[PDB]
Amino acid sequence: MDIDPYKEFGATVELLSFLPSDFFPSVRDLLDTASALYREALESPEHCSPHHTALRQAILCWGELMTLATWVGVNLEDPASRDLVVSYVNTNMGLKFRQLLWFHISCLTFGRETVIEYLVSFGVWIRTPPAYRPPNAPILSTLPET
Amino acid sequence: MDIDPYKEFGATVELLSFLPSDFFPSVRDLLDTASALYREALESPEHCSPHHTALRQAILCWGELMTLATWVGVNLEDPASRDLVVSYVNTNMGLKFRQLLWFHISCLTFGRETVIEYLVSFGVWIRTPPAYRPPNAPILSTLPETTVVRR
Amino acid sequence: MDIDPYKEFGATVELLSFLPSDFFPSVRDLLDTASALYREALESPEHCSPHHTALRQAILCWGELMTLATWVGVNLEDPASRDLVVSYVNTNMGLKFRQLLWFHISCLTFGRETVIEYLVSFGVWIRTPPAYRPPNAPILSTL
Amino acid sequence: MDIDPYKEFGATVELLSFLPSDFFPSVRDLLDTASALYREALESPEHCSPHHTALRQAILCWGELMTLATWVGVNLEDPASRDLVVSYVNTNMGLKFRQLLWFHISCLTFGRETVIEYLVSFGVWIRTPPAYRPPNAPILSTL
Amino acid sequence: MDIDPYKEFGATVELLSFLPSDFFPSVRDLLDTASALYREALESPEHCSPHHTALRQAILCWGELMTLATWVGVNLEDPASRDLVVSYVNTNMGLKFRQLLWFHISCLTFGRETVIEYLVSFGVWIRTPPAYRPPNAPILSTLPETTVVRR
Amino acid sequence: MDIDPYKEFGATVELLSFLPSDFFPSVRDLLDTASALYREALESPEHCSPHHTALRQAILCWGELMTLATWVGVNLEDPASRDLVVSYVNTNMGLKFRQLLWFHISCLTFGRETVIEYLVSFGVWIRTPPAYRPPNAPILSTLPET
């Protein structure tokens, strides 16, 4: 079908592409963050959020992708095609997967509407010329002010 | 017909004339901003606002200009004239379209009165020689001058 | 973004396609009509209507296109490429621009709904084979 | 002073420009129509209407012009200059005078607003290209 | 008659002398600003304010001076004296006109008391020697610089 | 812009041109009259009228024009162009300046509406043939009748 995973939460693939691709963290860092913070909740029998549900699904999808990478590295003799497919998996699919993981984790942490507003503001700040914008790049924090 | 596109919305050409050419982002950046923010409203059959209407019209003009640039690059085997026309289109007319798109988008985003007050203050800042003015120009943003998002 | 300009006004490119391209008046005649009727309203500092807004936008766009044509005729030495560019601007782009001007002006004048029923009725009259097509084609009026 | 005569009545020179010059009837036919319909009102000692006032003024102006033509034909010996002046008076000035007479008479007859919508509708019909221009052009009536 | 055009409004020539002569913008930029956001009032038949009245008078004087410059460039076959007169008019006579225009425009926009206290504060900032002079100077502005607005 | 200085008071350049140009007094006489009558008010920090404001502005404009004439007479060696520019300043610009000064001073003295009515009546009297008009030319006075 024509399914946008972000629209049920209030965003779009176009909105998450409004940001650079080099901005999103690594799949490993995102998974470590998730395991550090929301592990008990993801491993629980209760849903506890659509965010939690989608996050479980994405984590398992990426685990299957890593299993595929390993099966390739083993059963494929051609080093060219081997490394080629592995690079494809790690980069092209990893980009979307870390987009999704970042979105859901940042939502759970700070706030869904907050994350959406941050997407918009950062995508505008990056396209604004430097002299006519704030110097520091936007960022999300849970550390209150004084 | 002596028409000012900004007089309808309360601004004026002489008011935006003080904005340098380096202040406006690229046409592509502005179009991406619009398509990411107000796309479902621009593609909507409802007159959401005059800003939306003018934005649609400007986007379509720019699409036709891109079509023209492509047709030129194809049908003009004279590289000199071809590149010359393409540069004119992308620079001189692109400047006006950047101006217009930026005005309408910034209005939709922040507030029309806010944008107009910002333009006034920025004209004041830019008309001043550099020595007798602060180094950093005014900034229009929904964020604080410190870019941090809690909640 | 695929932005149909006539969607917010209740029509579509596929709906105006009922009209041929040779049916539309000249940009000059359309602009003369506009300047004769709605000049003071287009020069006005008010959102008189969305049609007024779009009409201002289109007029300024066409003015910039004429500026382009003149700048070309001046700064370009190759007469072949010069004439090619000028003819393209005048004909191909002018087609869409007079489509738009005609639509919005006919709206202002006769009614948006009236223009829409005119479009459908002209589509009927043109789909009609010639043997049974009446000579007097549809047209707008107020009398 | 730039005094548009049709402004106080709701039209403009640019609006009547929609009408060609060969479209207007002859001064003689217009005056015959006036004398057949509104003669007793124009000879009346009352401000029947601003149209009546302007019509009286125009008729007297044209009468003085005819007097000029006759005085020329009498007192001028150079037939070249005589014919030149007479032709100029009859054609160039007669054009404006029959414009004015037609406007005011059609007002009296059918309605000022009706005349205005007629002007705009005729502008449409004439901007229309011939292939899609209906043969039957707009016209005023009461039936 | 000692006619200080600024004491009618609360200032003086000596109060505006705090501002250097190179601080004032161009006559053309000032005219564009006026035409942009006070014109409908300037052309009105109503006494909007003494600022408006004095501004009308100054604009008309400057228009007549431009007329004079043109008439000179036309009727003076001596290019030397021609350019001399033209440069005098453009620079020496125009300095005072742009002083006056800046004053009245800024008083119409940001207020009169604000402009006066701004003159005072800028006089302080400029009397201050450079080693102890802050980088940023007083700059008239309704908008705070880092204005992050979310809607 | 398109600015008429007389319309904010209720007159026009066309209305002040409705009178002859040889009718207006000299700039010197007008300035002497102003200094004799309204000097304290023009030198005061209070506005006291739009008339007073415009009059101050015009006086200073004419002072700058005289300064220009002097600077010319000094720095210009060519006597032809020197006298030419000086005559232009004195005559062409002086005409408008004395029109303005006369208008504002007569307003302050007698009455704005009175001055307007006088403009109209005098411009009609001058164009009327002599035999069919009053013989004496109109004039403004503050001297009441008996």
UniProtKB/TrEMBL annotation, chains A, F:
Q: Which residues of the full protein are shown?
A: 17 to 162 of 199
Q: State where the protein is found.
A: Secreted
Put simply, this protein is called External core antigen
GO molecular function term, any single one: structural molecule activity
- Give coiled-coil spans as residue ranges: none
Query: Which UniProt keywords are present, listed alphabetically?
Result: Host-virus interaction, Viral immunoevasion
Q: What GO cellular component is one of the record's annotations? A: extracellular region
Superkingdom per UniProt: Viruses
Q: What family name appears in the similarity comment? A: Belongs to the orthohepadnavirus precore antigen family.
- What is this protein for, i.e. what is its function? May regulate immune response to the intracellular capsid in acting as a T-cell tolerogen, by having an immunoregulatory effect which prevents destruction of infected cells by cytotoxic T-cells.
In its record, the post-translational modification comment is: Phosphorylated. Cleaved by host furin.
Automatic annotation (TrEMBL), chains B, E:
Description of post-translational modifications: Phosphorylated. Cleaved by host furin.
Q: Which UniProt keywords apply?
A: Host-virus interaction, Viral immunoevasion
Compartments where found: Secreted
The residue range of the signal peptide is none
One GO MF term on file is: structural molecule activity
Predominantly, its location class is secreted
UniProt GO cellular component terms: extracellular region
State the source organism's domain of life.
Viruses
Q: Is this entry keyworded Chaperone?
A: no
The record's function comment reads: May regulate immune response to the intracellular capsid in acting as a T-cell tolerogen, by having an immunoregulatory effect which prevents destruction of infected cells by cytotoxic T-cells.
What the record says about family reads: Belongs to the orthohepadnavirus precore antigen family.
Name recorded for this polypeptide: External core antigen
* Source species taxonomy: Viruses, Riboviria, Pararnavirae, Artverviricota, Revtraviricetes
Residues included from the entire protein: 17 to 167 of 199
